Amino acid sequence: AALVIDNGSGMCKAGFAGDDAPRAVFPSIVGRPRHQGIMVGMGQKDSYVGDEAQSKRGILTLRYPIEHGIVTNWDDMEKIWHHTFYNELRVAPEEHPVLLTEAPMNPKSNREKMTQIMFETFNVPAFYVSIQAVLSLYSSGRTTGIVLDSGDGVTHVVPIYAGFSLPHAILRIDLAGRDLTDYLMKILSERGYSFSTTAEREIVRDIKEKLCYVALDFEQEMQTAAQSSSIEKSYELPDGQVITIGNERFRAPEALFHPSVLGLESAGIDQTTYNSIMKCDVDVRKELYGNIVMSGGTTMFPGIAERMQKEITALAPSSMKVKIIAPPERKYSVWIGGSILASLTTFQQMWISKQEYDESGPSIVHHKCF
Amino acid sequence: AALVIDNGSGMCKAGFAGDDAPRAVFPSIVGRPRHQGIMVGMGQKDSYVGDEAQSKRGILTLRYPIEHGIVTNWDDMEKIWHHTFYNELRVAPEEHPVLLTEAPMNPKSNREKMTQIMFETFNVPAFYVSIQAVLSLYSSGRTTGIVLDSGDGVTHVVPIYAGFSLPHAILRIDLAGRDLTDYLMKILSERGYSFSTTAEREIVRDIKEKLCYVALDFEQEMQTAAQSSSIEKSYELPDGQVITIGNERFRAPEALFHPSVLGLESAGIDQTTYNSIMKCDVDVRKELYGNIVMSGGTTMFPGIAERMQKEITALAPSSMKVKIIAPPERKYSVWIGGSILASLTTFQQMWISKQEYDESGPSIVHHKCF
Amino acid sequence: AALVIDNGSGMCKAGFAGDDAPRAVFPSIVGRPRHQGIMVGMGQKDSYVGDEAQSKRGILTLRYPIEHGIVTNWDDMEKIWHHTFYNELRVAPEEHPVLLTEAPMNPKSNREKMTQIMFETFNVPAFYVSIQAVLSLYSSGRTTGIVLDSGDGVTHVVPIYAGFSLPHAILRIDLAGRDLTDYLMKILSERGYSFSTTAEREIVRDIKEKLCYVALDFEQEMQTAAQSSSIEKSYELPDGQVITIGNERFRAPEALFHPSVLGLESAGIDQTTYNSIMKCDVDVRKELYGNIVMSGGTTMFPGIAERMQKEITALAPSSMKVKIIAPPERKYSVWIGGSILASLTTFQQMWISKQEYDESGPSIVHHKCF
Amino acid sequence: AALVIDNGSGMCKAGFAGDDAPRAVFPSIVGRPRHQGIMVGMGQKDSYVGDEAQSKRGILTLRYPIEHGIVTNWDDMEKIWHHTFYNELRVAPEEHPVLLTEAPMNPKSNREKMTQIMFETFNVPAFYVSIQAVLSLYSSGRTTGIVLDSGDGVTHVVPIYAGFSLPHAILRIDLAGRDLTDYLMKILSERGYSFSTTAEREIVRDIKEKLCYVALDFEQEMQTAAQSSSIEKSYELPDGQVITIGNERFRAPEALFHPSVLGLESAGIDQTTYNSIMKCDVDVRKELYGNIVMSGGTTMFPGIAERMQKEITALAPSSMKVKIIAPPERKYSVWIGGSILASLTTFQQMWISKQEYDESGPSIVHHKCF
Amino acid sequence: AALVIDNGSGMCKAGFAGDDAPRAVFPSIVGRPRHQGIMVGMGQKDSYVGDEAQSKRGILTLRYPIEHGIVTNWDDMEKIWHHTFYNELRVAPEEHPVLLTEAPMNPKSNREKMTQIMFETFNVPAFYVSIQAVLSLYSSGRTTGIVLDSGDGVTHVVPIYAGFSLPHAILRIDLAGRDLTDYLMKILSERGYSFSTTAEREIVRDIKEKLCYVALDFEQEMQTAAQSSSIEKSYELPDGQVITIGNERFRAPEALFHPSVLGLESAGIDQTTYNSIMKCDVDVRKELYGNIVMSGGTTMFPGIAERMQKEITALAPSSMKVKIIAPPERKYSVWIGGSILASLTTFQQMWISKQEYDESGPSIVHHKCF
């Protein structure tokens, strides 16, 4: 009975192998009080994790331990994993194998510290780290495809042909949904709405998840928003204030396709996918063009698949059939692939056991998870 | 067996922790004779405290030692506390912990002198100072709410969310029931009734407590009072003279909502409550709008809760549910919260002992009562 | 050609706007015979007003219609105003606008009855009521100052800054020259001089106007009067009896600064002026300290300005320049300000006309004279 | 002959291009009377602007039309600009180009309404809006530097490298000198000094400008203030009262470096400057570390440059030379840069003319001022 | 007075025939601004070439016009040649013959467009294109040898025996120093150092030039780097950050000998040199084994000659004397050979004149430069 934990930058997904949906999906935030507790007998913890930190947002500073796929606070990461094991899944980690997720081209100390914390703090019997895009390909039943994975920390593009990784063609951008949340925070001040705190950042993230979309033609959509008022929508703040947003619904996701509005020199996701395809051998590009898979929460914008199809079809040769696979459950696709991968009988010999960690230290994670 | 003393500007409330009502409620006045005693063998003290000063009003000058929450006469304060301990409660203060009350944003010398007098003159074994609004929240069983406390000296608005104080949003006005008594004294001269002495000030305070109320619509109430005579009431003076009052029943409490009739530049209590709510984080305002708590004697005007609800609902967004909590026993609510707070076992480690005062002086009251 | 009538408690001042002195100054007394007329053919009226009542004092009971600024006998007030219009000024009131005076914080029925009597009994074309202290500020050419006005009925302290009234800081004491006359009547019985009748009250008023003064240091003056006989003066009664007075020359005006010798709980005039200054905003106090204006007959005591300056300089901060303005013509200053105010062209639109009274009744005096 | 107007939240600076100092520096306040004018013939306007509102503080409510860099009252803004053009500069705005200032990340309606009021109410021939920090860089002769601008409304940090703006790295805090004035008002009540009105707010602003400073080590300065009395200073109030202040001289500016004492979740000015430097490209950080420019009145605290240098040198790598440029005339630096920018011949083609406004409306300000 | 221009992918070398060193060596980059110029009067070109683009790296996107020896942007190539002629050499190209360089097995349109731009844009009187490896053999005084030339775009291996080219044995790999820079960028993310921009690519190129070397035994060097810390070195970034690198010093140049770590199917430089020798006739191999010449910047790694000697001696028969010629000035060797070749009197009849270009078009470059 293995445990599958998709530990992304923004949201933690956790559950059991063999299941089809994550049992526990909760934000990976740690909240700490900014003020002094004055009423006694209440019961006031010094730390709040997950949905409890989200429900007490107005008196807490919220911190993400993971930034751009890299854990920057390991004590808060340990707190989040403890909340995963003991409060959400309600299991003992000493009797369950654990499969973790990681973004490609991460520092090696991240993998080593994850292995050390899993084997020493939680005393797991078995452990493995997988790349998220490979799990996204696992969930779709495919062995050939190019995966665009965009969550909250980073966006990575990984091509796989016939079950073989092509690590020279793996591309990675530091743009994901948190940068889109910050950009929407910046461009909402043009209408007079000020958001600066971490709780207001969570409010703007809710605004982006509810009302933002990807325009098929950006300049035509700007002309339509300038002409009429059919684009503007209303959102109710937690204090009852109603705000109205116009072109910011599609200007903020446009940073995914044109990162220069963030001051970034990198290319957009369509150009990155095309460059990853062109970095591969000429005999695999046809299968990659027809098997473009998207996973993650940032691929859940309305109209992102049609725009991605249009831009890649513009980039590709005219005889190539470009197909974008954006299933309705793609936001959990990485986890679903983990739930497939930990459930295979061929995978059962690829676990890192406690004996191998005892004889080799954390560095065995560089020899068993490749 | 702790002692709870709500030492407000106008009235002193005193009793034991674990009780539900104050054992001794009496005016905090010191009376001194204006004339010379001519009959010998009577027994004539040079000072009268409390109800004895109130029963001998016609030959005494009455002085309040506390003005706007700040003690201005410490010898008379010592006399009132001596009358509390030895004549009203009839206890020895050397064997009972004492919990005192204070308004927020008071001078630090007030707290220091209260600690010094409690530990040196009365030799208490333990001591604590609390903010009155926090005790008002204690009495209602709430840990989240915004407290409007108005007694005789000052009106303070304190928001608390999830047991956490928000001291940047605490607001304080120097308008309370004594200023309303003085305003009623001023506007009763329009009908030909002259009140200038301190005993006449106590008579006008009795008139305000018996016959004044808060109008729902002030201009409509003025039109109704100008049209008919159904608003006018009669009051009997101590010498048997019967006076009749009309619009002064609702013109005097209207200074609570429009302080400009007192020559004050501050806002009314509804605007102050709204400004304190808007000074807080956006994620706590919903719980503050539905948990507006009033305590004190100035909140015992008839119709003040309906008017407060109407004005705050006018100020708040239309989707916000404004609830005013005005319980029938709110005039003693601060004391009741003290009787709860001194009765908690978790509070028993937060007393300032005699050893800490001996090793640190009065300044320990700035480190233990926050 | 407007008429200016300063109708004080003790003395009536009357004349024309544009003049510098009142045309007719006479006591506001009504005298009635105590005995039966026995000689026929003389011509014996049932009522004597003014100087005729003063010249026939020994067979009349003298009554003041105004007590402490409030008219208590309106028929005698009508008699005095008739004597003003037809015997003193010798005009027709139906063709002259009339400007009247009133003390602040008077009953509203006094103003209403004054308006009704002026418009109905005397049929004036225009009418206005002013506060006396504002006219005292008008006479000195000042727009900023604090006026201490003390005549025969009441003493009022009114601060004005930059032409703006500060009605929350207006203070009023029921001590003036009539109470000083009664106190001098009481303390002259210690030397064996009995005065009980109204004519003897007028004699004692003459004694106070001729021989009383304000001591700079009261205890030093009492020591000087106890040591030598240089303070004692002689006064000749109307029957030729010569009386001698000592410390009563300065003990009777000392009730202005210490009202407790009258059995009054109020403060003295220096403390009342200081309390009125401290009731104002902190940015106007500097101009009020240097512009203290005195008007009225009770401010005509010798040495009252030096004593007022000394006590206010003791009360004020040491960096404040206290200036007392006591001009030699201040006893008529209110009237002089009326003669200025009714002579201004900007004031000519502020009269209450007969049409406004016909359409609104007496209550228009609460809407036009504020 | 262009006009340069630095229209900040607290103070309005105005003059001519080519000059080195602003011709007219005056507070941007509008004062309205709280009371009724009682003396006629004075001349009493319903509105007072600037120094006339400051000289009549005790009878006025003072309002700032700009809060945190955003105009909240446009009629009072029009009054202040009318006072600038016709009473201070004494010019006709119809023949002079006008260059205005704005804080970055302001609402677009502020710029649009400024353009509409300048072109329609005042009928200017030409118009431009600049960012204040770019003008601060203009005044120092620099084309590369990071500007910390803190006045009365907001604090903004803007980096510029080789004449190129970096708008993704522009940071903005809502903390400036008005919040410091309010914090000093709050912490002066601990010593028993009460300030609540707008005139008292101006008095506390004068106290902060005269006696407050930035401590190099805050805890060492608190220990020094607790040990001896060499830190305490005396201030004379307008009514002559002398108050004494101790650690509040350096506790109030400490909110610039630790905003959590205001209940704010933002970082201090040193951390904000460091975060703006780290938001830029790695090849420009060396020039930004050595060219940190401060401008505005809130940077005129004694010891703020040494403390800023110490904290940034603590934050920066040890091989980096941190240089803080705090010239003695930096309080006018924005205006001086405007006087440079409007005097350049290359700038003369960048004005928004009346023809462009007539053909395009206010929205042309989003196409010409970037 | 001919001009010799070695126009490689990364660096442009330029000077005069008869000299021993290039007069001007500068990077062949064109920089364009990513942001908008905000400060006027500076002087801001839209394009920066060479060292000016390198000194303004943080606000520019840098582009190489030559990729793998082939010009991909001819306008930027024209800009670089204009900067060579007019800013670096400071000559007129209309009076100087120009000798250019090219890699073998290039497209014919590259040579044709180079001839057309030289004769039409710059109006040169004479022109020639040479292969770089033949010039490397010219610089060493040799007429027999096999040249391994590796710069920034491509690596080519050209054997020449007795002055005769052997074009069937010329080999070409698309691996050179730019691919090594990209590989070092990829493997520096394992230590947590992120480099993605073009300026960061130039920084990583500086890191590779300063700290990278070729290991004699790769597995022994990996064991030594894993055992101790004597291999790790420190580098200071332009912002003052100090980074530490370990095995990446020799892992990145190992792609020259094992291209499979780049995802390339080609052989290493030692195997390519051996395969080029074995493609020749059996009677010339002895002279080629003893005359292996290296030129270019990628041959300037420390230890590349010893490793090349070891691997070729392993590949060659044991009786063959393998000699690697790696002179200290080999990075400029191509240019030096050009400076020899354009200085020979026998070469003076082999120029392509303007008359031949006018009568034949660009295609004459396929008949005169073989």
Ligand SMILES: Nc1ncnc2c1ncn2[C@@H]1O[C@H](COP(=O)(O)OP(=O)(O)O)[C@@H](O)[C@H]1O
């Ligand atoms: N419907 C939606 N539309 C747009 N963005 C979304 C939506 N739902 C979630 N997101 C964004 O996806 C991000 C996290 O998704 P996820 O892939 O679970 O992150 P991670 O894998 O990094 O935990 C968040 O930044 C969130 O704002």
Ligand SMILES: Nc1ncnc2c1ncn2[C@@H]1O[C@H](COP(=O)(O)OP(=O)(O)O)[C@@H](O)[C@H]1O
């Ligand atoms: N029924 C009432 N209606 C209006 N005011 C009241 C009533 N009862 C008491 N008060 C006023 O409340 C004030 C004191 O109440 P309390 O809260 O006990 O004062 P404190 O807390 O300052 O001692 C007095 O000024 C009194 O006039």
Ligand SMILES: Nc1ncnc2c1ncn2[C@@H]1O[C@H](COP(=O)(O)OP(=O)(O)O)[C@@H](O)[C@H]1O
């Ligand atoms: N020279 C004086 N010294 C002291 N008191 C005086 C003098 N002259 C008049 N008075 C007193 O002033 C009072 C009346 O003065 P006035 O101001 O005219 O009164 P009102 O304004 O009330 O008519 C009388 O009581 C009189 O005794």
Ligand SMILES: Nc1ncnc2c1ncn2[C@@H]1O[C@H](COP(=O)(O)OP(=O)(O)O)[C@@H](O)[C@H]1O
């Ligand atoms: N010497 C000083 N020390 C500290 N603060 C000052 C000083 N002089 C002015 N200030 C503060 O600077 C603020 C306004 O300065 P300024 O930069 O002109 O404001 P703005 O640019 O917003 O008009 C005011 O809040 C004032 O209190």
Ligand SMILES: Nc1ncnc2c1ncn2[C@@H]1O[C@H](COP(=O)(O)OP(=O)(O)O)[C@@H](O)[C@H]1O
């Ligand atoms: N000392 C060195 N060690 C390793 N590589 C170097 C060194 N010096 C230069 N290079 C590399 O050589 C390449 C360019 O050299 P060069 O032969 O001048 O190129 P090209 O001939 O293509 O212009 C660059 O990629 C640079 O990184």
Ligand SMILES: [Mg+2]
């Ligand atoms: Mg993820």
Ligand SMILES: [Mg+2]
């Ligand atoms: Mg109370």
Ligand SMILES: [Mg+2]
């Ligand atoms: Mg009078």
Ligand SMILES: [Mg+2]
């Ligand atoms: Mg400014």
Ligand SMILES: [Mg+2]
């Ligand atoms: Mg080369």
